């Protein structure tokens, strides 16, 4: 498990890959203004020291499945997604590593599932929107923006050790 915060390009790579898969720009898509909003209350709060690892694992599991769909594979670059799957697996393996070891990962009460449930419904909600929008180009950009912001409000929170007051 990554106990010391020496250096990591895991989540930093995933975020970049999401931006690289960008076919278009939401900035030029003035129609799909139906944003979602990543559940940061159950990610950036309470959990900021390994406790957020179980959530991250299942969170990426949702991302992996959602992007590994026949829809996403046909919407984004299959070559970029090819690496995306590998990176997702890498992050997954890195996160579950702490679960395999005897680190303080699974110690919290049922609230551990609550965080996962929050992300679960968030992703399901996105799937519904995708179906409603027939998986349109700009609609995908919304998803990209959301997921990109999601990473900035999840794994990025572990690096958010600026203020302490």
């Amino acid at each position: 498990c990554d106990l010391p915060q020496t250096h990591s390009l895991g989540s930093r790579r995933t975020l970049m890959l999401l931006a690289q898969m960008r076919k278009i720009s939401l900035f030029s898509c003035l129609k799909d203004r139906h944003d979602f909003g990543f559940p940061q209350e159950e990610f950036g709060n309470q959990f900021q020291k390994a406790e957020t690892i179980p959530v991250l694992h299942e969170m990426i599991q949702q991302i992996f499945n959602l992007f590994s769909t026949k829809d996403s594979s046909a919407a984004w670059d299959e070559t970029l997604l090819d690496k995306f799957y590998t990176e997702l697996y890498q992050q997954l393996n890195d996160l579950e590593a702490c679960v395999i070891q005897g680190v303080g990962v699974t110690e919290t009460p049922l609230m551990k599932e609550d965080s996962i449930l929050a992300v679960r419904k968030y992703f399901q909600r996105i799937t519904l929107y995708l179906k409603e929008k027939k998986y349109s180009p700009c609609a995908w950009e919304v998803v990209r923006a959301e997921i990109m912001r999601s990473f900035s409000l999840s794994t990025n929170l572990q690096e958010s050790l600026r203020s302490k007051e």
Binding site: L26, F27, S28, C29, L30, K31, D32, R33, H34, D35, G37, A145, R149, S152, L153, R162, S163, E165
Partner: protein, 212 residues
């Protein structure tokens, strides 16, 4: 004569300056033939580009700047800037750009002084009397020190130092050292070097008569 002809008819150069924790944006648009006098400023976030929100008092105004202290209260999200200019009663331009408060945040208006002592510099940045405890913003202030040509960037902790006069004592200096102090900030990069008007002060010189 290079590239394309200078389009001095639609600059759309926007810039936001922080005047005592007050976000004020100004718009620059050179007029070639048609000269508009009234403009309308709109803003929004990345979350939804179509969520164009118009500012009050800064709509169909004859002003060239607009203040939105409590309007612009976000550090994580990006603020989109859309300026709709109308020449008389006809739409002329509607350039849409975006700003990042967590990347720019040009802070220059605050007054700052520096007392020069024989062996130390007494920096005194007069920041607004604002309670940081009620300010949801994360950033660092760097005190630049250019003494005798030696450029140094002192970045201390701003926790309880931006709520008024910022006192910073720079020691380990030798007599006769002209120094210039610059007040700029930083966040997660060094591209936020808002080098304000460098104030040069000369502390007591030691270039007197050399004797035993």
């Amino acid at each position: 004569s290079y590239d394309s002809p200078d389009y001095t008819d639609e600059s759309c150069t926007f810039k936001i300056s922080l005047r005592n924790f007050r976000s004020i944006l100004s718009w620059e648009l050179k007029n070639h033939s048609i000269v508009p006098t009234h403009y309308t400023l709109l803003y929004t976030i990345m979350s939804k580009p179509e969520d164009l929100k118009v500012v009050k008092n800064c709509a169909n105004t004859t002003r060239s700047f607009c203040d939105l202290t409590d309007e612009w209260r976000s550090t994580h999200e990006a603020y989109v800037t859309v300026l709709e200019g109308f020449s008389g009663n006809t739409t002329l331009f509607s350039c849409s750009h975006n700003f990042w408060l967590a990347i720019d945040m040009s802070f220059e208006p605050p007054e700052f002084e520096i007392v020069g002592f024989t062996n130390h510099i007494n920096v005194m940045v007069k920041f607004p009397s604002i309670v940081e405890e009620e300010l949801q913003f994360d950033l660092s202030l760097v005190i630049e020190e250019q003494s005798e040509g030696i450029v140094k960037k002192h970045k201390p902790e701003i926790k309880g130092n931006m709520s008024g006069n910022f006192t910073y004592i720079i020691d380990k200096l030798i007599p006769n050292t002209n120094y210039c102090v610059s007040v700029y900030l930083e966040h997660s990069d060094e591209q936020a070097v808002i080098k304000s008007p460098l104030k040069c002060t000369l502390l007591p010189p030691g270039q007197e008569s050399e004797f035993s």
